[model samples]
Target: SVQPWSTIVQGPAESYVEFVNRLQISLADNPKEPIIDSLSYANANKECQQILQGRGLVAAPVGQKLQACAHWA
Candidate 1:
C-alpha cells in the first residue's frame, strides 16, 4: 500500500493578501450578502496550508483522531 499524503502551497503572502483585498472589495460592492466571503476563502486556504504543514488544529477533538491525509489514485 502506498502512503497517503497531501500538499498545499499558498504561493506567497502577497498573493493571498491581494486575494483578500479583492474579496473585501467584492463584499463591499455586495453588502446585501455576507461581507466575509473573501476572508472566509483566505481562512480556508490557510487551513489547508496548515494541514499540509502538519499543524492542523481542530475545533473538536473529543471523539477520535481526525483523518487528515488525502488519497489519490
Candidate 2:
C-alpha cells in the first residue's frame, strides 16, 4: 500500500485537472499499487468535488472525468 493521496487531491493551490493528471501518472507508473486502485480514485474524486464546491466552481465536468478514470481503474 502506498501513502494516501488525499493531500494531493485536496491541494487548494493546485488545479483539479493537475491533480487528476498526477493520479493518472502515479497509477500508470505503479499499476499494482492498492493506493492507486478504484477505491482510491473514487475517494480522490469525492474530495475533489468537495474542494471544487467549496471554491464555488462547477465540478461536474471534472467529476465526470475523474469518475471515468475510476471506472477504468
Top TM-score: which candidate number? 2
Candidates in order, TM-scores: namely 0.31, 0.40
Candidate 2 Cα RMSD after full superposition onto the native fold (Å):
8.4
Candidate 1 segments whose C-alpha is farther than 4 A from its true place: 1-14, 31-39, 42-73
Q: Give the runs in model 2 whose Cα sits over 4 Å from its true position.
A: 1-8, 31-47, 51-73
Model 1 alpha-carbon miss at residue 66, Å:
26
The worst-scoring run of ten residues by lDDT in candidate 1 lies at 64-73
Total residue pair clashes for candidate 2: 0
lDDT of 2 by residue, 1-73 (tens): 5454444452445544566668666556543344444433354556555554555543344455444434221
Q: Which ten residues in a row have the lowest lDDT in candidate 2?
A: 64-73
Q: What is the lDDT of candidate 2?
A: 0.49
- The sequence of per-residue lDDT tens digits that candidate 1 reaches over residues 1-73 is 5211111123344344343345445545544123242233334355443553464333322111123412100
What CA RMSD would you report for each candidate?
Answer: 13.9, 8.4
Clashes of each: 0, 0
